[PDB]
Amino acid sequence: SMSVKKPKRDDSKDLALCSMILTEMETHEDAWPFLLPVNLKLVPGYKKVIKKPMDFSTIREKLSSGQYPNLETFALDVRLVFDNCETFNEDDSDIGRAGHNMRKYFEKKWTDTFK
């Protein structure tokens, strides 16, 4: 509360560390569905159904331009990529499996780097 604070957690490396995670996600062999924004002209249903599109290139540009206020807003956009993928794609499809695999990969790196 006013004039009562928990001890200051060192957040000075968070930007660098989220960039490293994001690089590892970009270079994963199963990243291909997520590298670029879904083409809303060419994919029926996407625009109406997926209210907040997100992709790795969009996260990279937000990261690089100071549009994440803290590491939790970064994790929210990464998770959005996978939540969108599960909304639109069957579990038993190449893309649906890619999304599960990537979500797992991310959540381990997130735990190991920060928790």
Side-chain angles (χ1 to χ4, degrees), residues 1-7 9-12 14-114:
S1 69
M2 197 186 328
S3 310
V4 185
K5 290 300 165 327
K6 291 200 185 55
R9 189 210 161 243
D10 183 12
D11 65 342
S12 59
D14 287 357
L15 183 62
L17 285 159
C18 288
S19 176
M20 285 170 47
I21 295 165
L22 184 57
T23 295
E24 293 162 353
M25 276 190 311
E26 291 163 330
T27 61
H28 192 295
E29 72 162 292
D30 303 336
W32 60 265
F34 312 114
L35 298 173
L36 300 178
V38 174
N39 182 333
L40 300 179
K41 301 165 188 311
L42 302 188
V43 179
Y46 210 85
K47 191 170 197 302
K48 185 68 178 271
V49 172
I50 298 296
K51 297 314 186 179
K52 293 174 74 177
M54 188 51 58
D55 70 281
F56 295 169
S57 79
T58 301
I59 300 173
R60 170 73 71 191
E61 183 62 35
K62 287 180 68 170
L63 194 60
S64 295
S65 60
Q67 293 184 65
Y68 293 114
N70 54 54
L71 85 169
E72 300 308 332
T73 61
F74 169 81
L76 282 169
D77 266 355
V78 175
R79 290 170 182 146
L80 174 66
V81 172
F82 308 126
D83 293 344
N84 289 343
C85 183
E86 283 199 46
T87 291
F88 211 79
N89 292 269
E90 282 293 342
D91 296 343
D92 188 8
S93 63
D94 294 277
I95 292 171
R97 286 187 279 281
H100 292 290
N101 287 351
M102 297 301 310
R103 180 196 300 274
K104 186 88 174 175
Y105 189 72
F106 169 69
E107 288 307 345
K108 167 114 161 78
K109 304 278 181 184
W110 190 250
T111 294
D112 293 357
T113 301
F114 295 115

